[PDB]
Design an enzyme around this catalytic site. Structure first.
Site, PDB file in Angstrom:
ATOM      1  CE  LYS A 163     -17.530  -2.301 -10.655  1.00  0.00           C
ATOM      2  NZ  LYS A 163     -18.193  -1.284  -9.623  1.00  0.00           N
ATOM      3  N   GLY A 212     -30.883 -10.553  -7.850  1.00  0.00           N
ATOM      4  CA  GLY A 212     -31.155 -11.971  -7.553  1.00  0.00           C
ATOM      5  C   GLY A 212     -30.281 -12.729  -6.807  1.00  0.00           C
ATOM      6  N   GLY A 213     -29.256 -12.003  -6.387  1.00  0.00           N
ATOM      7  CA  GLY A 213     -28.156 -12.852  -5.430  1.00  0.00           C
ATOM      8  C   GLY A 213     -28.739 -13.220  -4.046  1.00  0.00           C
TER       9      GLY A 213
END
Ligand SMILES: O=C1CC(=O)N([C@@H]2O[C@H](COP(=O)(O)O)[C@@H](O)[C@H]2O)C(=O)N1
Ligand SMILES: O=C1CC(=O)N([C@@H]2O[C@H](COP(=O)(O)O)[C@@H](O)[C@H]2O)C(=O)N1
Lengths: 226, 224
Positions: B70, B184-185
């Site tokens: 990142k 939860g994707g």
């Protein structure tokens, strides 16, 4: 800042040690130890020499360590990063505010549990900051305040922005600022709002790092104490 | 994506290896190697075991490695981070776009100069992403296109946002997406737009990682 419960940075000067070699890093830091007791170590050095470099700096030098990792992941990963970093001997860690409140909270919680500190980076010192960061700067700073954040990082290159950040976070907050020297920021103007300045290349790339450090300190003698 | 020269990720499944111990990390990875050949290694593991861990994964399993760092610093620092990362065997590195075009370009220049790849993270998958990143996501994606970025990262937790991101980057771009499982994707809706999904805890924390991976692949078999 009006609080006394903050890290006491010698001469209000934090060394940004971004050399990527242990030899040069240890040499320059050692040569300026007389003027600086707080060192900001980032990924350039850590990814080159490993996290143990942190322990070694405290061993060789009696300095405080700020891990400038600009933590900017999801809450779960942020927690892991902070844990590993504090375990390694970092006194504080710098975290990005743009990823949101939950990401910042994750870092704050780990810091709280381990008795360390989080510094929130609300906006940056480079040209690119104007594209997306400044537009959210005010809200990011306010989010930090609402979250109970007490330590911040603001741009030396933008004194006009630093003034605003200070107003938002208040006097009960601690603020450090990078962008001095190489990027054009002025130590004196910056210390009108920041509690300590961060200096990298102007010192570590100088033919005489010790003289460079001494020069900066001499230029801000009127703002030095307490 | 419709590009032919894109990263070839086995079963369109990338392992987010975020365990923080070299033993568990290496073991679990070995356990799912018949199902995955692309591993995303982040700071949780790197800051715990050192950068040499990347080469170890390559030597031991011959997997491709995406360094999920990142990257989000000023241009000059991003430059150093990417250089050190590509010298460690990373095939690619993930960078943030929020810091602006100069910060991203710095990463692109190093990747080009060292023959590696850069993935631009547009919108993130967690709830907090809605506060500041989501509103800037489309623009960050367009910035990526203008800069020549060809690899991107988008959220599986918001398929509708992923669809919009795909529209912006085009079919000649490669898109990977995290958020499947723990967050939860839905793999199905996600793969409608993403070329490959990233899965972490749903696999590395499973009592049986191999079975976990196997199951994921079974649920998306019609897309393989
Ligand atoms: O807005 C910011 C944040 C930051 O931490 N930094 C860091 O501060 C240091 C600046 O070093 P230099 O004095 O320009 O050589 C580097 O380690 C940067 O990554 C910055 O320059 N601007
Ligand atoms: O928006 C994003 C970006 C990202 O890289 N990730 C990463 O993707 C992985 C997701 O893991 P998990 O499947 O939720 O356990 C972690 O390594 C995260 O840091 C994410 O979850 N959301």
């Amino acid at each position: 800042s009006r609080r006394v419960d903050v890290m006491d940075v010698m001469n209000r000067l934090i060394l940004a040690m971004d050399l990527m070699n242990r030899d040069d890093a240890l040499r320059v830091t050692g040569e300026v130890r007389e003027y600086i007791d707080t060192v900001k170590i980032g990924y350039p050095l850590v990814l080159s020499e490993g996290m143990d470099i942190i322990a070694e700096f405290r061993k060789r030098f009696g300095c405080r360590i700020i891990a400038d990792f600009k933590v900017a992941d999801i809450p779960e990963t942020n927690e892991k990063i902070c844990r590993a970093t504090f375990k390694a001997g970092a006194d504080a860690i710098i975290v990005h505010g743009f990823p949101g409140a939950d990401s910042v909270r994750a870092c704050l919680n780990v810091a709280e549990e381990m008795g360390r500190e989080v510094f929130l980076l609300t906006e940056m010192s480079h040209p690119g900051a104007e594209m997306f960061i400044q537009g959210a700067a005010d809200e990011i700073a306010r989010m930090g305040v609402d979250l109970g954040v007490k330590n911040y990082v603001g741009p030396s290159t933008r004194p006009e922005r630093l003034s605003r950040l200070r107003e938002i976070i208040g006097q009960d907050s601690f603020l450090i600022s990078p962008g001095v020297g190489a990027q054009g920021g002025d130590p004196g103007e910056t210390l009108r709002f920041a509690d300590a300045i961060i200096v990298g290349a102007s010192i570590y790339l100088a033919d005489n790092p010790a003289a460079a450090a001494a020069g900066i300190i001499e230029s801000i003698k009127d703002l030095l104490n307490p």
